[PDB]
Amino acid sequence: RPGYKVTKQRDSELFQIDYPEIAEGIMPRHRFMSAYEQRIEPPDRRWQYLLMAAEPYETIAFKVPSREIDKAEGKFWTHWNRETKQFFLQ
């Protein structure tokens, strides 16, 4: 449960997560999750989180208030620089 370091940046035509070594073949994975289910369930739920996870580190979430701007998909739009250990997604 170690919080990695994310580097959000407004693009135009993207998140840059530095990840220490996993030592496994499985690349880091993203998923789009809704705020409807949570450990505390408090009011104001009603937005989406772009969630990132890997076994080495812990899980990280990014709030999305816009309805559509990008596609949170694995094959279409992610890249894994496993050698330098930086993770990509746009």
Binding site: P2, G3, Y4, D18, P20
Partner: protein
């Protein structure tokens, strides 16, 4: 703050090299108060514990069809003898009245045309 800096930095090294260094460093400077922090007897002991895990996670802040086939084959024969990529015997033709829509990569038959020019170029 010295204490937080030595904690943060020592934690970093022990985070990279593993907790095996925590033991070394602790026993190497056990009498030295500069490393008293490594023992549970110090107040910042709990702070350092977090730093180790944090540096390991790499998150903490470091210090500071014939017609179609024959036109595609014939155009490919005269394209493949080109002296330059855009100085072909077909670039002149498009501008001189000759409607040929498969020259643009927007038409699916371009991918077969590229194979035919590659084959005619192999046949040179």
């Amino acid at each position: 703050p010295e204490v937080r800096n030595i904690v943060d930095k020592t934690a970093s090294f022990v985070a990279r090299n593993g907790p095996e260094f925590e033991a070394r460093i602790r026993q190497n400077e056990i009498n030295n108060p500069k490393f008293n922090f490594l023992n549970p007897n110090d107040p910042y002991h709990a702070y350092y514990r977090h730093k180790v895990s944090e540096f390991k996670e790499g998150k903490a802040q470091e210090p500071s069809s014939a017609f179609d086939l024959d036109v595609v084959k014939l155009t490919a024969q005269f394209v493949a003898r080109n002296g330059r990529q855009f100085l072909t015997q077909l670039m002149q033709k498009e501008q001189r009245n000759y409607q040929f829509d498969f020259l643009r990569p927007q038409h699916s038959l371009f991918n077969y045309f590229t194979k035919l020019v590659e084959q005619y170029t192999k046949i040179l």
